[model samples]
Target: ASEPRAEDGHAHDYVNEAADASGHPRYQEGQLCENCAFWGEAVQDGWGRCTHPDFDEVLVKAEGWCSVYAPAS
Candidate 1:
């Protein structure tokens, strides 16, 4: 599975992962793939299926963000 890098396509308001003093990823508070409705179950690595109509099942990074971001239940 491919880790979602910052260079990947994202929305204009995309919030990149922030690393704290510990050097670990301190992702955007509420703007993460795992919180998005389009984000599918983890398949492998950090990649998962994106259910967004535009993405159409394209594999996306769990931490990835896009214009269609919507909070999942």
Candidate 2:
């Protein structure tokens, strides 16, 4: 499973293991942001979108997640 690391893509030496080894690790609550797929980019404002399926756009706290997670390249 993947471990939660900084968006920079560098893994931390200490907390390499996830609390639940079976599940994929994710950013801590309120850690995800507009860059992540979970937050959609608006064609108009280019702002953060919510990962929630039913919702179109919501103000994110610069941290969250969704099905479309990708690292900044």
Candidate 3:
């Protein structure tokens, strides 16, 4: 029912903040895990699993950022 957040990032070169990824080739302002297409439903406030293959193993913070980010509909 719960999984710990990827505190140090597991894959996809994740970062704690989208702003922190300002220089990322795939990054753009205003993107965050919570709003990403791969982000699963929250298991707790601001904490949840990511449905993306590289991130499914750990919880991703709502404000997190990753190279594979895809915006939600």
Candidate 4:
């Protein structure tokens, strides 16, 4: 979903999901960067911080979104 569309904008389209048995992907919950408890931001960059569940720090675009979102605890 990272493709750039002429009629749209922002990285919000980069959300990822797991594939179901039919090979179709479905939205999963509890793993989105925005909903993480540690999400942070630098307003100037318009990017949010995400120390992945098991990875190093990642900077996600401000408009990014995902089905795995978990409300900040």
Candidate 5:
């Protein structure tokens, strides 16, 4: 089955929009799941898998932001 989007954000403080992560210390304006170092293959609904251990249970939105966000270099 296609992975489901992280409705509860799993472990990290995930927000649907990157702007919503403004209050997060690790959040940067353009930081997003799709660009994160942990991002994996595209899944569905603009969501994709996150290699982060805590997020293995679900897919994160492409524009989603989380505390553990690490942009790809």
Candidate 6:
């Protein structure tokens, strides 16, 4: 099933389940949303906020991945 729609007028991308799997272009094994610059915080158990500019979402799984991921500075 698809996730809830964004309430803040933001675009959405479904969380990548194969983020940690091999052969993904942007996803490196072991790289997680919790360690990404776009990761907001613990919105709830096992989930967090996605602050990605083009695809912001109030709820993102901690284990999810996307192409726009950047290491937090």
Number of the top-ranking candidate, with TM-score as the measure: 5
Per-residue lDDT tens digits for candidate 2, residues 1-73, read 1212223212221111222222345544333455555554533332344445443333333333433445554
Clashing pairs in 2: 31-63, 32-63, 32-64
Task: Sort by lDDT, best first.
Answer: 5, 3, 6, 1, 4, 2
Better of 1 and 2 by lDDT: 1
Worst 10 contiguous positions by lDDT, candidate 6: 5-14
Candidate 2 matches the true fold with a TM-score of 0.28
Q: Which pairs clash (backbone N, Cα, C closer than 3 Å) in model 3?
A: none
How many angstroms is residue 15 displaced in model 6 relative to the true structure, after the best TM-score fit?
Answer: 3.3
Error of 1 at 8 (Å): 1.2
- Over 4 Å off in model 6, which ranges? 1-21
Candidates 2 and 4 compared: the better one by TM-score is: 4
- TM-score of candidate 1 relative to the true fold: 0.56
Candidate 4 per-residue lDDT, tens place, 23-64, comes to 314334334445555555533344555444422224454344
What do the candidate models score in CA lDDT, each in turn? 0.53, 0.36, 0.79, 0.38, 0.80, 0.58
lDDT of 4 at 65: 41
TM-score of structure candidate 5? 0.84
After superposition, the stretches of candidate 2 with alpha carbons farther than 4 Å from their true spots are: 1-31, 34-56
Q: Model 6 scores what on Cα lDDT? A: 0.58
Off by over 4 Å in 1: 1-7, 10-28
Q: What lDDT would candidate 3 get against the real structure?
A: 0.79
TM-score of 3: 0.83
